[PDB]
Design a protein around this nucleic acid. Sequence first.
DNA 1: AAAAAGACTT
DNA 2: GGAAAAATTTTT
DNA 3: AAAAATTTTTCCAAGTCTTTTT
Length: 567
Amino acid sequence: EEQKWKWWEEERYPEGIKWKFLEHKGPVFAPPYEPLPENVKFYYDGKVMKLSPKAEEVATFFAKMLDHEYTTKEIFRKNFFKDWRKEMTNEEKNIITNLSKCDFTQMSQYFKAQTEARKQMSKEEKLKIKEENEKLLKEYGFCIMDNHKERIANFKIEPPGLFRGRGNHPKMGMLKRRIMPEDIIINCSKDAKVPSPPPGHKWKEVRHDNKVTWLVSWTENIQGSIKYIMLNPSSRIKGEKDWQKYETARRLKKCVDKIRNQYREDWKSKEMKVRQRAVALYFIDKLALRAGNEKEEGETADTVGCCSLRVEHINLHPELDGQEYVVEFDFLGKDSIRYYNKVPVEKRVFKNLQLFMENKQPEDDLFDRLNTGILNKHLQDLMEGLTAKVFRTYNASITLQQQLKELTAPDENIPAKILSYNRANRAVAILCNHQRAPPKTFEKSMMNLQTKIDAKKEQLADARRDLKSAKADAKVMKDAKTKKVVESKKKAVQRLEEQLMKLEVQATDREENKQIALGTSKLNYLDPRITVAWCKKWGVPIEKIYNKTQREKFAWAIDMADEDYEF
DNA sequence: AAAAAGACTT
DNA sequence: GGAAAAATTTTT
DNA sequence: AAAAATTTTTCCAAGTCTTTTT
Ligand SMILES: O=C(O)CCCn1c2c(c3ccccc3c1=O)C(=O)c1ccccc1-2
């Protein structure tokens, strides 16, 4: 039965407390390892051998990745092998001395032949598995938190595999290791039925911590960090925190000018420490850069943010581009994605970066005397709850709002307005540096979308031919009588006019999303109310922008704030 | 403090 | 999330 | 149909800021 809870109209919980009641059926473990059949052989130095279950499982993972470029890299093969030997018996360790003499060319083909027979199942054996995954979602994918049933995001644990990560990770190849129930920590209420552990096992511990959001927790062997199973974005716990993110971003708008004037005068300060902080805060505001946390050497790939930049990442140019005082940025950020931008800065910012790069080696930190802790404690003394991450949400949302007013033409149709919406949502991705939407299939599919626009251009032309025939026959065979034909064929041209201005609009839309990714900005940086306030203003239906799960996530926006909403 | 953990976003 | 995969749905 | 374009699942990490230990 259709209910629909409006958690936004309820009262908030006092400091710390996230809930009072919590019950779940625990996580879902990856199905146990099924050993390779008799005809699938593994060869070492040409000779045949059958590996034990723990060592064969680690071999399968490598065999499945074998098509890739990374399996030829030295760090990958060093790491993989250290973790492979660990999972071997004493007999195998003595025979298998190197990865190079190991032949996986028969295991890499079985998993490619097992994929063919997986995508070519019968209608009864495919609908049997579709009902097996559906009963899991029904029994494990939901939980009860405070009088209401909310959906879980990651209810299943990730199966073991080989670590890869992004970029030139120093730990690529290491075994991700299987998570057993003895590594799992269950969080729930005292008065709630504690989930029964999978037969033959026991949990690590059951705790009742109402100060936290998570239902299940464990530790990953790669980094050593703690992984969690929290609720999907449609919930109160996640949605309330999402609303408070944009509310803190609204309170920044009201103090942004005072903050901009204070750091502009701070470039002229007597302390070198206060200069760096202001120049850092300038790049966080102008270029929308990440704070830049300090990460341990060898634990993750060499990536930087703002406070972590080095003298090798910036190149100063007094001339270049026709413009003066240009700072050429060239570095790798989060997820190892290249940030390259030649941007003109102000008089005092340039002569400051020259003082920061002075008599320093290329691997030294540009912003010494500065880390993320100093910058954030400074911002907290400027406004309550302010952090460098807010400047990203602010510069995103205020840009969406003003670009929605600048790019929307009132006299246009609804499909043409979505093109104007996507142009505004493009400007936010050309700020936060979000890139690439499948450019490999986008070469053939675009040229085959163009041949379907020309196929409807002929129908409009054949309609304009039939209306010109009616305008010429309304004269020789009189009006009123035989003029009703000029009426119905004038509405046929109109039905075909906006049908073409839909197809040609979806073409310009797809061609402009080449090296742009609308996703991360659409779901994490932009205030949904700005969009709902635009949809209710121009009569553009909400489903023609947000899909089911986005509408489900942003239900707090669709109900609250009308057309008169200003960020 | 200030590393290390932990708890969330992205 | 972004990309590859699988699941649908719409073209030929 | 049977292919092909779409849409929807599915695979898998890494930042930020806070809070505890040392
Ligand atoms: O599918 C799920 O139920 C897990 C969602 C978690 N989740 C994950 C990633 C992510 C990336 C960007 C925004 C949100 C998420 C997110 O919300 C990501 O890059 C990743 C790698 C490995 C495991 C999980 C994630």
